[PDB]
From a paper:
As a well-known tumor suppressor, the tuberous sclerosis complex (TSC) integrates cues of growth factors, energy status, and various stress to maintain Ras homolog enriched in brain (Rheb) in GDP-bound state, and therefore keeps mTORC1 in check to limit undesirable cell growth. The TSC complex acts as a GTPase-activating protein (GAP) toward a small G-protein Rheb required for mTORC1 activation. Mutations of TSC1 or TSC2 genes cause tuberous sclerosis, an autosomal dominant genetic disease characterized by the development of histologically diverse hamartomas or benign tumors, including skin, brain, and kidneys. Here we present the first cryo-EM structure of human TSC complex and elaborate on its characteristic assembly and GAP function.
The structure was determined by cryo-EM single particle reconstruction, and the cryo-EM map was refined to an overall resolution of 4.4 Å. The TSC complex consists of a central core and two wings (termed wing-a and wing-b) and the overall structure exhibits an elongated arch-shaped fold with approximate dimensions of ~390 × 133 × 88 Å3. TSC1, TSC2, and TBC1D7 assemble the TSC complex with a 2:2:1 stoichiometry, generating an asymmetric modular organization. The two TSC2 molecules form a pseudo-symmetric dimer through tail-to-tail interactions. The coiled-coil domains (CCs, residues 746–971) of TSC1a and TSC1b interwind in parallel and form an extended two-helix bundle with the dimer interface being as much as 2386 Å2. The TSC1 dimer makes multiple contacts with TSC2 dimer and stabilizes the overall conformation of the complex. This parallel dimerization of TSC1 leads to an asymmetric formation of TSC1–TSC2 tetramer and recruitment of a single TBC1D7 molecule, generating a unique and characteristic modular organization. Each TSC2 consists of a HEAT repeat domain (HEAT), a dimerization domain (DD), followed by a C-terminal GAP catalytic domain (GAP). The cHEAT–DD–GAP of the two TSC2 molecules adopt pseudo-symmetric fold, whereas the two wHEAT domains adopt distinct conformations due to differently associated TSC1. The TBC1D7 associates with and stabilizes the C-terminal helices (residues 937–971) of TSC1a/1b but has no direct contact with TSC2. The result is consistent with structural observation and supports the notion that TSC2 uses the asparagine thumb (N1643) to accelerate GTP hydrolysis of Rheb and residues K1638, H1640, and L1641 of the catalytic helix function in supporting the conformation of the asparagine thumb.
Numbering used by the authors:
A (entry chain B): 614 to 623, 685 to 748, 758 to 937, 1015 to 1079
B (entry chain D), D (entry chain C): 777 to 825
C (entry chain B): 1526 to 1599, 1605 to 1626, 1636 to 1755
Write the structure that this text describes.
């Protein structure tokens, strides 16, 4: 029955209460998982709800209703890991989904973080954020606080960074914050920078998101994390090699070779963007060119930096 | 066989009528895009000013 | 010698590059090699998505060399700038060549507009590793998914579909696309071709260390 | 005799369908380049603006 009735592409809203009922009581057999697999495509084709006058809310509630409770086990891990996809697909309708119910389902996802897994949950969180960020606005802080405790899982390694990045590209959402948010973000990111454990893809992505958040990070309270950051960095080079892994954090003054290059580039970017932001492209005003055109020049390499000096000879004047 | 193919060709002419009327609607939307093109031509003249 | 090292070393921008490619499919154009790169025209939703992708761009000469070979000759060559990621789009409608350019990119965009499914077999390509299929729907909400080249799905998950409304599909689309491009560059580099590392910063740092080694 | 009748009806349906699809053909062939020229001119106006 379920198989056939879920294929309507031209008599409606009856099957709606039918579904409501069959999910309401828990048949406690594979038929449960069977209808749960019948759901997601019905959500792909959750298109005829143009007829159903927003009764989906109740099933959504029913969803969260059967999210927790022994009345489900009257497979529970699979129960969660399959109901999370269906509410995931459900999240599309930001409008008809009740506002307080959206708050509720956000809390459901928040509790689905601490779980057997939440990869699906966290990517759905990214989606709901881009979709109904107004709702996430309140959950964001405690969300990240709990996220502090995922403990360097190579499994969720990718989706976390993905979500952090996506969020960062949404400034107006986090338009206001405070230090602890960014501090927690960096603490979460840092361990994912292992030179051996995680992926080179994961490594480079981690450095990218670190950099871009640190950019999006407020100019005030920007230097704060800098030692912690390089601490978080030097604490990722703990035992990979320690030739010259010294602190060198400028708070005082103010193969594993790839790992060294990583540390180099990251702290250099920070130094470049600490204390202010500035595009990395110079273009001299015409006056400069006129003055030093063809000027006598000289370039040196003090260290990994490339210094260049040029001197005018009054070309334009004699012109 | 003959009656079955008659029904076949019936549904064929039917979907043909469907695509024909929807094609007339598409040409309607085409001339609507043309009217928007003339709106952009009003924009052309103010632009050349 | 060191002078020309300084020229070439200076070249590589501190702004990470992103050559991306956009496609379009139609009913007759479904599962077609000579009909996918043929049409210089797409759908209405396709066009509004395109103009929503990035902001206006022109390929004039007064602008610096910050544009790549794709979009050098013929036409809006839509792009999107940011702190370190530059994104050239290579619209399938803006070559008038096109096969030589669209195929070369690691990742591409494919707007599933016909109504049937889709596979990589549509175009042989050059390194078109991962695809991202996006399909419309009755209302504004539209579906998005991604496909591997059966070789790197371990690196990039594939069972990732999602619904997204109009004013949010371009952003999330380009986002996951950039993720895929990252994956592809990491894969190529993982093949150890001693080529430009994706992290252009560490790239030019290697450049400088190479200068150092050259002197001593 | 039934065979004769059904065959004649199918042939007439065939004539109808063929002429309808030629109509569809010509109108689609015009619509394509119509919208091509429209969007070309309009986006060129946008560029000039």
């Amino acid at each position: 029955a379920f198989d056939f009735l879920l294929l309507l592409r031209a008599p409606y809203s009856l099957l709606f209460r039918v579904l409501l009922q069959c999910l309401k009581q828990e048949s406690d057999w594979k038929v449960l998982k069977l209808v749960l697999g019948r759901l997601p495509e019905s959500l792909r084709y959750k298109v005829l709800i143009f007829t159903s006058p927003c009764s989906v809310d109740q099933l959504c509630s029913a969803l969260c209703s059967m999210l927790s409770g022994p009345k489900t086990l009257e497979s529970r891990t699979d129960l969660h890991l399959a109901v999370v996809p269906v509410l995931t697909a459900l999240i599309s309708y930001h409008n008809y989904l009740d506002k307080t119910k959206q708050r509720e389902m956000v809390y459901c996802l928040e509790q689905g973080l601490i779980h057997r897994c939440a990869s699906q949950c966290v990517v759905a969180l990214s989606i709901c954020s881009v979709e109904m960020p107004d709702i996430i606005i309140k959950a964001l802080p405690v969300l990240v606080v709990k996220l502090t405790h995922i403990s360097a899982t190579a499994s969720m390694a990718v989706p976390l960074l993905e979500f952090l990045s996506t969020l960062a590209r949404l400034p107006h959402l986090y338009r206001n914050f405070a230090a602890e948010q960014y501090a927690s973000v960096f603490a979460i990111s840092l361990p994912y920078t292992n030179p051996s454990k995680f992926n080179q893809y994961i490594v480079c992505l981690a450095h990218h998101v670190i950099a871009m958040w640190f950019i999006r990070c407020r100019l005030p309270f920007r230097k704060d994390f800098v030692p912690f950051i390089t601490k978080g960095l030097r604490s990722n080079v703990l035992l990979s090699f320690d030739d010259t892994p010294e602190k060198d954090s400028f708070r005082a003054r103010s193969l594993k070779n790839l790992h060294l290059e990583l540390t180099e580039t990251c702290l250099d970017m920070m130094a470049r963007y600490v204390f202010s932001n500035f595009t990395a492209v110079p273009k001299r005003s015409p006056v400069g060119e006129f003055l030093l055109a063809g000027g006598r020049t000289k370039t040196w390499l003090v260290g990994n930096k490339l210094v260049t000096v040029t001197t005018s000879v009054g070309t334009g004047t004699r012109s | 066989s003959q009656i079955r193919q008659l029904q076949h060709d019936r549904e064929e002419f039917y979907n043909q009528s469907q695509e024909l009327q929807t094609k007339l609607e598409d040409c309607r939307n085409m001339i609507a895009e043309l009217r928007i093109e003339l709106k952009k031509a009003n924009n052309k003249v103010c632009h050349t000013e | 010698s060191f002078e020309r090292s300084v020229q070439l070393l200076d070249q590589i921008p501190s702004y990470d590059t992103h050559k991306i490619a956009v496609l379009y499919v139609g009913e007759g154009q479904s599962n077609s090699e000579l009909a996918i790169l043929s049409n210089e025209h797409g759908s209405y939703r396709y066009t509004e998505f395109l103009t929503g992708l990035g902001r206006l761009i022109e390929l004039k000469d007064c602008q610096p060399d910050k544009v790549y070979l794709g979009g050098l000759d013929v036409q809006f060559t839509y792009c999107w700038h940011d702190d370190i990621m530059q994104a050239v789009f290579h619209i399938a409608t803006l070559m008038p060549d096109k096969k030589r350019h669209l195929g070369n990119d690691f990742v591409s965009i494919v707007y599933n507009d016909s109504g049937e499914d889709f596979k990589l077999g549509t175009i042989k390509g050059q390194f078109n590793f991962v695809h991202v299929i996006v399909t419309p729907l009755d209302y504004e909400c539209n579906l998005v998914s991604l496909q591997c080249r059966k070789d790197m799905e371990g690196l990039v998950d594939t069972s990732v579909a999602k619904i997204v409304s109009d004013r949010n599909l371009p952003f999330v689309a380009r986002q996951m696309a950039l993720h895929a491009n990252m994956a592809s560059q990491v894969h190529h580099s993982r093949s150890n071709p001693t080529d430009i590392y994706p992290s252009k910063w560490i790239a030019r740092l290697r450049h400088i260390k190479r200068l150092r080694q050259r002197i001593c």
